[PDB]
Chain A
Amino acid sequence: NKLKRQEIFADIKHEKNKERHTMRRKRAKEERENPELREQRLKENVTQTIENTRVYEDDLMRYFNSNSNEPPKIFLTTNVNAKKSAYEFANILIEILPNVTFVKRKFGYKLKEISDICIKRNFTDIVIINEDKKKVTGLTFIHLPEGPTFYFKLSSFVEHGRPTSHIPELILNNFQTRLGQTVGRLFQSILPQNPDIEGRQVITLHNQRDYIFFRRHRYVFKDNERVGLQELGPQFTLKLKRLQRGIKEETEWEHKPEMDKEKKKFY
C-alpha cells in the first residue's frame, strides 16, 4: 500500500533525524568538555572524497616540444567555411598565443600540403580549430617538426577586466600522470615561456578529474600574506583526444566511451 509505505517511513525518518541530532549535540558537548575525543574520532573517520579514493626523457623535451633556444612560430587557421564564431575565438587565441599569424583556409591545401608549406615557411606548431555549429567545438595543436598532435574538445565558453600588455605567468597543476604531464608540457611550450614579472598577470591551466580549465586572472599580494584575484578574460575547458604520435599517424590514447565506466582512474 502506497499510503502505508509513505506514512511508516515518514515517521521513521523523523525519529532517526531527532536521534541523530540529540547524539550529535551530546557528542559536541562532550568534545567541548574533552577535546581529545574529537581528535580520536577524526583520526578514524574520513570524508572519503573521490580524490582521496583514487584507484591508482631529456631528448623528448627538445625533440617533440618547443624550447627557448629559438622563438616558436605557430600557425593559426580555421576549418573551411568557418563562421564568425571561429574568427572571434581566433582573435582571443592570437592574443593569448605568441607570434600567431592567422591564415584563411583555401579549401584544397591538404594537411600534408599544409605541413610541407609550413616546413618551407619554417613554422613550429600548427593550431586548427573545429566548428560545426556557430560555436567553437574543438581545438587542435600539432608540433610540426616531427611532433605529435593534440585534439581538444571545447565544451564551455563565456565572455570583468582588460588584459594588460605584459606576458601572463604560466602555472600548471594536477599533471602527475604520464598522460597528463605530456599535456601539461604541451601547454607550457605552446604558451609563452618568457613571462614578465611586472604587471602581475597569471595564466593558469587547471584540471581536477579530466577536464582542463583555461582561466586568466589579475592577482595582488596583500598585507595578510594572502593573494586575491579577479576574473580576467574568457573561461573554457578542453579534453584531449587521440593523442596522435605523428602528424595524423598512430593514436596513443584515443579516449572513447569505454572509459568513464569505472567512474575513476581519470587520466
Chain B
Amino acid sequence: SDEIVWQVINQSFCSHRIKAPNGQNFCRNEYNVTGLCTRQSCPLANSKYATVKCDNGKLYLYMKTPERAHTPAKLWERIKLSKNYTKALQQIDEHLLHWSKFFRHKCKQRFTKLTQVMITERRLALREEERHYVGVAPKVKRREQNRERKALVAAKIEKAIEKELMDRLKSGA
C-alpha cells in the first residue's frame, strides 16, 4: 500500500534523501517534480504521479497510474507537449483532467521552469568568450615557480645588461 511505502520511505533510509543543513530533505529522483522527499511529492510513495521531463529539447508530460504498478518497465506514459507555452499549458490542463490541484499546479510550474531553462541557448548563442576556465594543478604551479626562480638566478640580468651596454656604445653611436 502507498501508506506502508510512504512510511518505509519517510524513515528507514529511503535511498534518495539528502539531509540539507537547513533540515529540508531533498529528493534526487529524476521523476520528482519538486525534488523534495515529502508527501504527495515522491513518485515511489504515490500510485498516481505526474511530472515533466525532457531528453532532447522536446518537453514531455510523464504521468503514472496504479495500473502499471505491476509492470515497472512502462510505468510512465509520456506525451509530447507540442512546445508552446500557452498551448502546452492548455494541453497539460486537458490531460490532467480531474487531477489534484497540487499535481496540476506543480506540473505546470515544472514545465514553465524547464521551458525558461531553454534560454541557455541565449548564453550559447551569445557567449564569444575568451577565458574558457582553466585549472592549474599545484604540481604544475610548483614547476612554474621554483624553475622560474632558478631561471632568474641563473640569468644574471644585470651582468647581461652591462655587457650589452658596453658593446652597443663601443663600436658606434
Which residues of A are in contact with B by a Cβ distance under 8 Å? Answer: 49-51, 79, 110-111, 128, 130, 132, 155-156, 171, 173, 197, 202, 204, 206-211, 213, 215, 217, 219, 221, 225-229, 237, 257, 260
Contacts and interface: CB of A to CB of B under 8 A. Distances in A.
Contact of B166 (A211, A225, A260): A225
Contacts of A206: 155, 157, 160-161
B50 to A, nearest CB: 42
A132 B129 CA distance: 13
B158 to A, nearest CB: 6
Contact of A50 (B131, B154, B160, B164): B154
Interface in B77-106: none
A130 B132 CA distance: 12
Contact of B161 (A49, A50, A155, A171): A171
Interface string B158-172: 101110111011000
A131 B147 CA distance: 24
Given A51-B154, A110-B128, A173 B162 contact: no
A130 B151 contact: no
B86 to A, nearest CB: 32
B148 interface: yes
The CB with the most chain A CB atoms within 10 A, among B143, B144, B154, B161, is that of B161
Given A204-B160, A213-B152, A225-B166, 11 more contacts: A130-B131, A155-B144, A173-B160, A204-B161, A206-B160, A206-B161, A208-B154, A211-B148, A213-B157, A221-B169, A229-B161
Interface residues of B, number: 25
B-side interface mostly: helix
Interface of B: 128, 130-131, 140, 143-145, 147-148, 150-152, 154-155, 157-158, 160-162, 164-166, 168-169, 173
Contacts of A173: 160, 164
| 4 shortest interchain CB distances as A-B pairs | A208-B155, A208-B151, A209-B151, A227-B165
